[PDB]
């Protein structure tokens, strides 16, 4: 029952909500360029006493980096950003609490490794690992780091058959964990362009390792739990604003949060139309409570 | 269909019934670079008895003629003379045939190959030019640099085989080529793992194919076993009559399944991946498909047929 948002309805909701959780890409900005009116509306929400949070499935930037980008583009400051890097670090903290010196093989960014380092998890394998040796015997003979207790698959632009081989070898130990930052098929880019998502890499590792990975990012509930551990979210008085139906809006529906769809990003009203037709009850979960052309549309009520 | 143990008498009955024998290579004829004991003698005897022998492989790393050299070196024999034709059908050659048929009429077909030099050689033989074989290491600081790399014009297919040089760059180029609707996506096999000696394994081609499928939001066409195209690739040259042909294999999900779906008599050899315990599990109907994966006859090794060939 997607309602079209008007200034009157926006005022009504704003009275009801104290916390707003936003996806960054496709909602607040595309690339390094801000959505028209978005910085001012978020500044105004802060002035009206609303608490702002940010949830992202990208593992390439640290919390402080996302916060600096928000500050430079005028969105303000209080941390308020919850990305798959930080939340992956928290997951590994929880699942490796008993390990004395946990080490993880990270097919991912320096930011993911830094976030793991902050929670006490040493990371190995960030960066290039180009193929060496002419056959499987050479590839399977390469020495591995000792005491590796987890394999974390993030956005690895250096992904190679060597990293897949080392990951599978680490995962031959039953105690070893397999964690994926997200399961997205595509990473949205500017101008409607896209590149391969972390989900492709994670699925390669899963298939080779005959394992099912634990997914940290949206639509997984783990990212909401990571936000709630610090915010203490009240589902009834909290709203999730997002651009993608399969990740942001589904997360909102599963966690009983109010949902707003912004049409500045990947998803559009036509997609919601197909979802409103009952092919599956799940697709009904992928429908927003309200829709806005842009987040600046909250400025009339603010 | 009751997985009968092939006794020498039963084996002789089979020899009278079949004129053509199709063998899987790894786990049946040889393990790695070392031959299975007694297999070379058995196949040489089969050639002497006038039986026609063919070979089916899911590995895309060797050309037909190269496989023939390995067979000759290990004592399995070779095509007799000038009239005789090649006996080995691997995923490189049959992938080339698949693109030959599916790119019929294309003026100068080009393919982006995440695969071996052998696959490129076979494609050249069928008239398909190949681009992208070999390493493509990461360059640049961001997506704009990666997406600024120039792509070749008139690429009409993406072929994913065993690529140990697979990289995020090659995946990115593959999706960019596949953004063209006419472009085909072909996979040599969908195996999650490549079996190796001593129970070891490495990641299979299926992982690479799946990554490309997910990013391109496409479904790949698989050439290798259990897909029936490899059987059609054999038949295009052999002209097989299914009831008078036997398929010998080591793996239930690939070799024996191909035999059953193509109405070939099946012999399971226990020198490879599959065991009688696995066929036991399949004989218990957990899945409808598992009934298809049951051998008509079983032997510990193909050398077990040597008494009936003398």
Numbering used by the authors:
A (entry chain A): 12 to 89, 96 to 319
B (entry chain B): 11 to 320
The authors write:
Phosphoglycolate phosphatase (PGP, also called glycerol 3-phosphate phosphatase or AUM11) is an evolutionarily conserved metabolite damage control enzyme that can dephosphorylate and thereby repair three adventitious glycolytic metabolites: 2-phospho-L-lactate, 4-phosphoerythronate, and 2-phosphoglycolate. PGP belongs to the haloacid dehalogenase (HAD)-type superfamily of phosphatases, a large, widespread and evolutionarily ancient class of hydrolases with emerging roles in human physiology and disease. All HAD phosphatases consist of a catalytic core domain with a Rossmanoid-fold. This core is accessorized with so-called cap domains, which are mobile elements that can shield the entry to the catalytic cleft.
We had shown earlier that PGP exists in a dynamic equilibrium between homodimers and -tetramers, and that the mutation of Cys297 to Ser (PGPC297S) abolished disulfide-mediated PGP tetramer formation. For subsequent crystallization attempts, we additionally exchanged the catalytically essential Asp34 to Asn, which abolishes PGP activity towards its substrates. Full-length murine PGPD34N/C297S (here referred to as apo-PGP) crystallized in space group P1 with four dimers per asymmetric unit, referred to as AB, CD, EF and GH dimers. While monomers A-F and H are well defined in the electron density maps, large sections of the catalytic core of monomer G display very weak density. An inspection of the PGP catalytic cleft showed that the active site of PGP is organized as a channel, and that Asn34 (corresponding to the Asp34 nucleophile) is centrally buried within this cleft. Coupled to this rotation is a shift of the substrate specificity loop (amino acids 202–215) by up to ~6 Å for corresponding Cα atoms towards the catalytic core. Conversely, the cap domains (Cα atoms of residues 100–237) can be superimposed, which then identifies a movement of the PGP ‘flap’ (amino acids 39–46 of the core domain) by >5 Å towards the catalytic core. Upon rotation of the substrate specificity loop and the flap, channel entrances become obstructed, and access to the active site is blocked. To our knowledge, experimental proof for the existence of open (chains D and E) and closed (chains A-C, F and H) conformations in a C2-capped mammalian phosphatase has not been previously provided.
